[PDB]
PDB file of C-alpha atoms and ligand atoms in Angstrom:
ATOM      1  CA  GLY A   1     105.923  55.119 108.317  1.00  0.00           C
ATOM      2  CA  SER A   2     105.188  54.419 104.614  1.00  0.00           C
ATOM      3  CA  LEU A   3     107.819  54.154 101.912  1.00  0.00           C
ATOM      4  CA  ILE A   4     107.513  55.394  98.349  1.00  0.00           C
ATOM      5  CA  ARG A   5     109.499  54.222  95.323  1.00  0.00           C
ATOM      6  CA  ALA A   6     112.566  56.443  95.061  1.00  0.00           C
ATOM      7  CA  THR A   7     111.876  57.005  91.344  1.00  0.00           C
ATOM      8  CA  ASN A   8     109.607  59.724  92.685  1.00  0.00           C
ATOM      9  CA  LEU A   9     112.835  61.646  93.371  1.00  0.00           C
ATOM     10  CA  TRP A  10     113.965  61.561  89.726  1.00  0.00           C
ATOM     11  CA  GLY A  11     115.158  65.027  88.734  1.00  0.00           C
ATOM     12  CA  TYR A  12     115.533  66.430  92.221  1.00  0.00           C
ATOM     13  CA  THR A  13     119.335  66.922  91.863  1.00  0.00           C
ATOM     14  CA  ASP A  14     118.931  68.442  88.374  1.00  0.00           C
ATOM     15  CA  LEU A  15     116.072  70.763  89.380  1.00  0.00           C
ATOM     16  CA  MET A  16     117.852  71.904  92.509  1.00  0.00           C
ATOM     17  CA  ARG A  17     120.905  72.737  90.352  1.00  0.00           C
ATOM     18  CA  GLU A  18     118.655  74.573  87.859  1.00  0.00           C
ATOM     19  CA  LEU A  19     117.477  76.719  90.816  1.00  0.00           C
ATOM     20  CA  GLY A  20     121.086  77.390  91.961  1.00  0.00           C
ATOM     21  CA  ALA A  21     120.691  75.314  95.135  1.00  0.00           C
ATOM     22  CA  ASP A  22     122.755  72.510  96.644  1.00  0.00           C
ATOM     23  CA  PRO A  23     120.437  69.448  97.074  1.00  0.00           C
ATOM     24  CA  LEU A  24     122.713  67.591  99.488  1.00  0.00           C
ATOM     25  CA  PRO A  25     121.783  69.588 102.689  1.00  0.00           C
ATOM     26  CA  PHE A  26     118.095  68.981 101.873  1.00  0.00           C
ATOM     27  CA  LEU A  27     118.495  65.225 101.449  1.00  0.00           C
ATOM     28  CA  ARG A  28     120.333  64.927 104.765  1.00  0.00           C
ATOM     29  CA  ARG A  29     117.775  67.131 106.579  1.00  0.00           C
ATOM     30  CA  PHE A  30     114.887  64.878 105.464  1.00  0.00           C
ATOM     31  CA  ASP A  31     116.736  61.564 105.987  1.00  0.00           C
ATOM     32  CA  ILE A  32     116.835  60.734 102.280  1.00  0.00           C
ATOM     33  CA  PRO A  33     120.059  58.841 101.315  1.00  0.00           C
ATOM     34  CA  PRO A  34     121.917  60.989  98.682  1.00  0.00           C
ATOM     35  CA  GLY A  35     122.376  58.370  95.974  1.00  0.00           C
ATOM     36  CA  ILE A  36     118.873  56.886  96.147  1.00  0.00           C
ATOM     37  CA  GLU A  37     117.556  58.848  93.125  1.00  0.00           C
ATOM     38  CA  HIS A  38     119.509  56.537  90.798  1.00  0.00           C
ATOM     39  CA  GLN A  39     119.184  53.217  92.661  1.00  0.00           C
ATOM     40  CA  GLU A  40     116.576  51.121  90.905  1.00  0.00           C
ATOM     41  CA  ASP A  41     114.009  49.386  93.123  1.00  0.00           C
ATOM     42  CA  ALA A  42     115.013  51.582  96.081  1.00  0.00           C
ATOM     43  CA  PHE A  43     112.361  53.127  98.367  1.00  0.00           C
ATOM     44  CA  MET A  44     112.420  56.278 100.486  1.00  0.00           C
ATOM     45  CA  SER A  45     110.415  57.754 103.390  1.00  0.00           C
ATOM     46  CA  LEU A  46     107.183  59.237 102.021  1.00  0.00           C
ATOM     47  CA  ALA A  47     106.953  61.640 105.011  1.00  0.00           C
ATOM     48  CA  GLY A  48     110.562  62.737 104.426  1.00  0.00           C
ATOM     49  CA  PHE A  49     109.997  63.184 100.715  1.00  0.00           C
ATOM     50  CA  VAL A  50     106.835  65.285 101.032  1.00  0.00           C
ATOM     51  CA  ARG A  51     108.406  67.488 103.719  1.00  0.00           C
ATOM     52  CA  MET A  52     111.505  67.959 101.529  1.00  0.00           C
ATOM     53  CA  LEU A  53     109.338  69.071  98.604  1.00  0.00           C
ATOM     54  CA  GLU A  54     107.651  71.664 100.830  1.00  0.00           C
ATOM     55  CA  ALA A  55     110.968  72.941 102.162  1.00  0.00           C
ATOM     56  CA  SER A  56     112.505  73.136  98.657  1.00  0.00           C
ATOM     57  CA  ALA A  57     109.491  75.090  97.379  1.00  0.00           C
ATOM     58  CA  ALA A  58     109.431  77.433 100.378  1.00  0.00           C
ATOM     59  CA  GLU A  59     113.133  78.089 100.938  1.00  0.00           C
ATOM     60  CA  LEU A  60     113.917  78.515  97.246  1.00  0.00           C
ATOM     61  CA  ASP A  61     110.812  80.647  96.425  1.00  0.00           C
ATOM     62  CA  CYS A  62     109.785  78.055  93.881  1.00  0.00           C
ATOM     63  CA  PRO A  63     105.987  77.679  94.256  1.00  0.00           C
ATOM     64  CA  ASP A  64     105.736  75.330  91.235  1.00  0.00           C
ATOM     65  CA  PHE A  65     108.573  73.044  92.390  1.00  0.00           C
ATOM     66  CA  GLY A  66     106.357  69.945  92.246  1.00  0.00           C
ATOM     67  CA  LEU A  67     104.987  70.788  88.796  1.00  0.00           C
ATOM     68  CA  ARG A  68     108.507  71.349  87.452  1.00  0.00           C
ATOM     69  CA  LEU A  69     109.903  68.166  88.924  1.00  0.00           C
ATOM     70  CA  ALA A  70     107.374  66.128  86.914  1.00  0.00           C
ATOM     71  CA  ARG A  71     109.407  66.991  83.757  1.00  0.00           C
ATOM     72  CA  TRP A  72     111.983  64.354  84.833  1.00  0.00           C
ATOM     73  CA  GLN A  73     109.384  61.747  85.806  1.00  0.00           C
ATOM     74  CA  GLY A  74     106.215  60.563  84.016  1.00  0.00           C
ATOM     75  CA  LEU A  75     104.947  56.965  83.717  1.00  0.00           C
ATOM     76  CA  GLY A  76     108.425  55.401  84.091  1.00  0.00           C
ATOM     77  CA  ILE A  77     108.505  56.246  87.795  1.00  0.00           C
ATOM     78  CA  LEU A  78     105.845  53.582  88.384  1.00  0.00           C
ATOM     79  CA  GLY A  79     108.424  50.891  87.523  1.00  0.00           C
ATOM     80  CA  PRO A  80     106.615  47.472  87.637  1.00  0.00           C
ATOM     81  CA  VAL A  81     103.203  49.125  87.705  1.00  0.00           C
ATOM     82  CA  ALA A  82     104.069  50.972  84.455  1.00  0.00           C
ATOM     83  CA  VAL A  83     104.715  47.612  82.769  1.00  0.00           C
ATOM     84  CA  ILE A  84     101.207  46.446  83.796  1.00  0.00           C
ATOM     85  CA  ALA A  85      99.608  49.748  82.753  1.00  0.00           C
ATOM     86  CA  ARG A  86     101.204  49.689  79.270  1.00  0.00           C
ATOM     87  CA  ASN A  87      99.848  46.186  78.614  1.00  0.00           C
ATOM     88  CA  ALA A  88      96.179  47.115  79.264  1.00  0.00           C
ATOM     89  CA  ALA A  89      93.681  47.287  76.341  1.00  0.00           C
ATOM     90  CA  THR A  90      92.507  50.899  76.807  1.00  0.00           C
ATOM     91  CA  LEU A  91      93.558  54.092  78.547  1.00  0.00           C
ATOM     92  CA  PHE A  92      90.934  53.388  81.212  1.00  0.00           C
ATOM     93  CA  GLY A  93      92.375  49.881  81.743  1.00  0.00           C
ATOM     94  CA  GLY A  94      95.857  51.381  82.112  1.00  0.00           C
ATOM     95  CA  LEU A  95      94.854  53.979  84.687  1.00  0.00           C
ATOM     96  CA  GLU A  96      92.628  51.556  86.570  1.00  0.00           C
ATOM     97  CA  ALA A  97      95.502  49.079  86.812  1.00  0.00           C
ATOM     98  CA  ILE A  98      97.654  51.865  88.211  1.00  0.00           C
ATOM     99  CA  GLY A  99      94.896  52.433  90.736  1.00  0.00           C
ATOM    100  CA  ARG A 100      94.579  48.769  91.625  1.00  0.00           C
ATOM    101  CA  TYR A 101      98.340  48.386  92.245  1.00  0.00           C
ATOM    102  CA  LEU A 102      99.214  51.893  93.465  1.00  0.00           C
ATOM    103  CA  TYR A 103     100.122  50.429  96.868  1.00  0.00           C
ATOM    104  CA  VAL A 104     103.166  48.942  95.114  1.00  0.00           C
ATOM    105  CA  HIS A 105     104.354  52.508  94.530  1.00  0.00           C
ATOM    106  CA  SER A 106     103.483  53.589  98.112  1.00  0.00           C
ATOM    107  CA  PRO A 107     100.872  52.184 100.549  1.00  0.00           C
ATOM    108  CA  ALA A 108     100.029  55.804 101.432  1.00  0.00           C
ATOM    109  CA  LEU A 109      98.488  56.564  97.992  1.00  0.00           C
ATOM    110  CA  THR A 110      94.881  55.798  97.096  1.00  0.00           C
ATOM    111  CA  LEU A 111      93.274  56.230  93.689  1.00  0.00           C
ATOM    112  CA  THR A 112      89.505  55.938  93.374  1.00  0.00           C
ATOM    113  CA  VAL A 113      88.242  55.436  89.799  1.00  0.00           C
ATOM    114  CA  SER A 114      84.541  56.018  89.400  1.00  0.00           C
ATOM    115  CA  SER A 115      81.838  56.858  87.007  1.00  0.00           C
ATOM    116  CA  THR A 116      78.192  57.559  87.656  1.00  0.00           C
ATOM    117  CA  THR A 117      75.009  57.903  85.636  1.00  0.00           C
ATOM    118  CA  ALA A 118      74.439  61.287  87.402  1.00  0.00           C
ATOM    119  CA  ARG A 119      77.654  63.050  86.219  1.00  0.00           C
ATOM    120  CA  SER A 120      79.963  63.373  83.145  1.00  0.00           C
ATOM    121  CA  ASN A 121      83.306  61.578  82.809  1.00  0.00           C
ATOM    122  CA  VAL A 122      85.401  58.958  84.598  1.00  0.00           C
ATOM    123  CA  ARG A 123      86.792  60.495  87.768  1.00  0.00           C
ATOM    124  CA  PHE A 124      90.249  59.644  89.075  1.00  0.00           C
ATOM    125  CA  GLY A 125      90.213  60.735  92.706  1.00  0.00           C
ATOM    126  CA  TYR A 126      93.590  60.771  94.469  1.00  0.00           C
ATOM    127  CA  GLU A 127      94.574  60.916  98.132  1.00  0.00           C
ATOM    128  CA  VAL A 128      97.856  60.875 100.042  1.00  0.00           C
ATOM    129  CA  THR A 129      97.208  59.521 103.524  1.00  0.00           C
ATOM    130  CA  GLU A 130     100.166  59.276 105.862  1.00  0.00           C
ATOM    131  CA  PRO A 131      99.966  59.810 109.680  1.00  0.00           C
ATOM    132  CA  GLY A 132     101.624  63.013 110.809  1.00  0.00           C
ATOM    133  CA  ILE A 133     102.559  64.695 107.534  1.00  0.00           C
ATOM    134  CA  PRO A 134     101.646  68.306 106.696  1.00  0.00           C
ATOM    135  CA  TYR A 135      99.221  68.646 103.782  1.00  0.00           C
ATOM    136  CA  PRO A 136     101.447  67.577 100.856  1.00  0.00           C
ATOM    137  CA  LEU A 137     100.743  70.429  98.524  1.00  0.00           C
ATOM    138  CA  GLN A 138     103.819  70.068  96.358  1.00  0.00           C
ATOM    139  CA  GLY A 139     103.295  66.301  96.478  1.00  0.00           C
ATOM    140  CA  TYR A 140      99.785  66.658  95.078  1.00  0.00           C
ATOM    141  CA  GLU A 141     100.950  68.971  92.276  1.00  0.00           C
ATOM    142  CA  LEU A 142     103.802  66.628  91.347  1.00  0.00           C
ATOM    143  CA  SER A 143     101.271  63.755  91.374  1.00  0.00           C
ATOM    144  CA  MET A 144      98.891  65.489  89.000  1.00  0.00           C
ATOM    145  CA  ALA A 145     101.644  66.768  86.662  1.00  0.00           C
ATOM    146  CA  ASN A 146     102.860  63.148  86.493  1.00  0.00           C
ATOM    147  CA  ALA A 147      99.292  61.989  85.829  1.00  0.00           C
ATOM    148  CA  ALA A 148      99.003  64.415  82.905  1.00  0.00           C
ATOM    149  CA  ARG A 149     102.227  62.947  81.445  1.00  0.00           C
ATOM    150  CA  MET A 150     100.847  59.439  81.951  1.00  0.00           C
ATOM    151  CA  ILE A 151      97.619  60.387  80.119  1.00  0.00           C
ATOM    152  CA  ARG A 152      99.669  61.610  77.134  1.00  0.00           C
ATOM    153  CA  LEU A 153     101.856  58.482  77.090  1.00  0.00           C
ATOM    154  CA  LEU A 154      99.012  55.960  77.404  1.00  0.00           C
ATOM    155  CA  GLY A 155      96.435  58.006  75.492  1.00  0.00           C
ATOM    156  CA  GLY A 156      98.485  59.593  72.669  1.00  0.00           C
ATOM    157  CA  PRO A 157     100.285  62.979  72.647  1.00  0.00           C
ATOM    158  CA  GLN A 158      97.011  64.947  72.141  1.00  0.00           C
ATOM    159  CA  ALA A 159      95.275  63.221  75.123  1.00  0.00           C
ATOM    160  CA  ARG A 160      94.157  65.558  77.919  1.00  0.00           C
ATOM    161  CA  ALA A 161      92.075  65.280  81.083  1.00  0.00           C
ATOM    162  CA  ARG A 162      88.855  67.292  81.023  1.00  0.00           C
ATOM    163  CA  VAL A 163      89.733  68.822  84.402  1.00  0.00           C
ATOM    164  CA  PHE A 164      92.253  68.677  87.251  1.00  0.00           C
ATOM    165  CA  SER A 165      91.106  69.416  90.797  1.00  0.00           C
ATOM    166  CA  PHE A 166      93.136  70.407  93.865  1.00  0.00           C
ATOM    167  CA  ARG A 167      92.087  70.752  97.527  1.00  0.00           C
ATOM    168  CA  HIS A 168      94.294  73.840  97.978  1.00  0.00           C
ATOM    169  CA  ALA A 169      94.175  77.352  96.564  1.00  0.00           C
ATOM    170  CA  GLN A 170      96.333  78.137  93.568  1.00  0.00           C
ATOM    171  CA  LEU A 171      99.969  78.663  94.470  1.00  0.00           C
ATOM    172  CA  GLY A 172     102.017  78.946  91.274  1.00  0.00           C
ATOM    173  CA  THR A 173     101.347  81.082  88.185  1.00  0.00           C
ATOM    174  CA  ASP A 174      98.528  80.448  85.712  1.00  0.00           C
ATOM    175  CA  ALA A 175     101.214  79.609  83.138  1.00  0.00           C
ATOM    176  CA  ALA A 176     102.808  76.958  85.378  1.00  0.00           C
ATOM    177  CA  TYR A 177      99.567  74.991  85.781  1.00  0.00           C
ATOM    178  CA  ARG A 178      98.592  75.427  82.113  1.00  0.00           C
ATOM    179  CA  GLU A 179     101.931  74.080  80.928  1.00  0.00           C
ATOM    180  CA  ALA A 180     101.905  71.075  83.287  1.00  0.00           C
ATOM    181  CA  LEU A 181      98.199  70.155  83.195  1.00  0.00           C
ATOM    182  CA  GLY A 182      96.999  71.655  79.896  1.00  0.00           C
ATOM    183  CA  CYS A 183      93.330  72.006  80.707  1.00  0.00           C
ATOM    184  CA  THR A 184      90.938  73.534  83.157  1.00  0.00           C
ATOM    185  CA  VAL A 185      92.301  73.426  86.675  1.00  0.00           C
ATOM    186  CA  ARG A 186      90.007  73.856  89.638  1.00  0.00           C
ATOM    187  CA  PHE A 187      91.311  74.958  93.053  1.00  0.00           C
ATOM    188  CA  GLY A 188      90.110  74.931  96.593  1.00  0.00           C
ATOM    189  CA  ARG A 189      87.834  71.929  96.046  1.00  0.00           C
ATOM    190  CA  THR A 190      86.613  69.023  98.134  1.00  0.00           C
ATOM    191  CA  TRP A 191      88.567  66.460  96.063  1.00  0.00           C
ATOM    192  CA  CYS A 192      91.888  66.061  94.275  1.00  0.00           C
ATOM    193  CA  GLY A 193      92.336  64.346  90.927  1.00  0.00           C
ATOM    194  CA  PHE A 194      91.234  64.542  87.300  1.00  0.00           C
ATOM    195  CA  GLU A 195      88.456  63.441  84.983  1.00  0.00           C
ATOM    196  CA  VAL A 196      88.648  61.864  81.570  1.00  0.00           C
ATOM    197  CA  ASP A 197      85.742  61.601  79.128  1.00  0.00           C
ATOM    198  CA  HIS A 198      84.521  58.206  78.032  1.00  0.00           C
ATOM    199  CA  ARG A 199      85.765  58.750  74.479  1.00  0.00           C
ATOM    200  CA  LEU A 200      89.374  59.094  75.675  1.00  0.00           C
ATOM    201  CA  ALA A 201      88.919  56.431  78.371  1.00  0.00           C
ATOM    202  CA  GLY A 202      87.958  53.825  75.771  1.00  0.00           C
ATOM    203  CA  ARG A 203      90.862  54.655  73.433  1.00  0.00           C
ATOM    204  CA  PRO A 204      93.101  51.631  72.717  1.00  0.00           C
ATOM    205  CA  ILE A 205      96.678  51.901  74.000  1.00  0.00           C
TER     206      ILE A 205
HETATM  207  O1  YQF B   1     104.180  61.750  91.772  1.00  0.00           O
HETATM  208  C1  YQF B   1     103.553  60.890  92.384  1.00  0.00           C
HETATM  209  C2  YQF B   1     103.498  60.945  93.890  1.00  0.00           C
HETATM  210  C3  YQF B   1     104.176  62.167  94.467  1.00  0.00           C
HETATM  211  C4  YQF B   1     103.965  62.256  95.937  1.00  0.00           C
HETATM  212  F1  YQF B   1     104.397  61.215  96.648  1.00  0.00           F
HETATM  213  F2  YQF B   1     104.557  63.334  96.443  1.00  0.00           F
HETATM  214  F3  YQF B   1     102.671  62.315  96.238  1.00  0.00           F
HETATM  215  N1  YQF B   1     102.828  59.949  91.755  1.00  0.00           N
HETATM  216  C5  YQF B   1     102.817  59.838  90.293  1.00  0.00           C
HETATM  217  C6  YQF B   1     101.417  59.808  89.760  1.00  0.00           C
HETATM  218  C7  YQF B   1     100.603  58.688  90.398  1.00  0.00           C
HETATM  219  C8  YQF B   1      99.212  58.680  89.797  1.00  0.00           C
HETATM  220  C9  YQF B   1      98.971  57.882  88.686  1.00  0.00           C
HETATM  221  C10 YQF B   1      97.706  57.791  88.118  1.00  0.00           C
HETATM  222  C11 YQF B   1      96.709  58.564  88.619  1.00  0.00           C
HETATM  223  F4  YQF B   1      95.488  58.494  88.002  1.00  0.00           F
HETATM  224  C12 YQF B   1      96.895  59.407  89.691  1.00  0.00           C
HETATM  225  C13 YQF B   1      98.175  59.495  90.248  1.00  0.00           C
HETATM  226  C14 YQF B   1     100.647  58.831  91.912  1.00  0.00           C
HETATM  227  C15 YQF B   1     102.069  58.866  92.395  1.00  0.00           C
END
């Protein structure tokens, strides 16, 4: 089964404490080694991680767990891939490099970057594909909240996607998604990701 860089766990101990919960029983349940959060270049089970997110959200009545966890994460979780992204010429170049090398983060993640004459914007379409996992709802929300942070870092603190799209129906509060994503959010769609206009895409880093 696929690994993911264990930077994707940054904040889990802190958030779990914020919610009044002991993280250690969760880590052991999902076969995640307890210190791995803080071990650079370590990798963890992607299946374990996504199931742990779902259990943390469900058992703690925290529907926006994934969105909240992104507050401790952002571009730095991409480790070597962040170094490549920051050295691109334009925000597009940065995000497309992330897409090209996203397998370095986890082989289970696919980013499709496309634009078409027939439609507005550059679309960043994102998929988690891992045999045997439940639909990684919290995983997708964490991914997109991270993406929004990455847009602001690479694109300047005013930079926003035009839209975020999720396959699932809205779970958390309106306020939760607005705070994390900071734009139109569409739910229950055929694709997951975000779009950026060409003006922002071509902005120098
Ligand atoms: O937070 C995660 C993964 C969380 C997990 F594993 F649960 F899915 N990720 C951070 C954001 C990243 C990304 C970067 C640029 C894009 F345009 C789209 C996505 C995917 C991995």
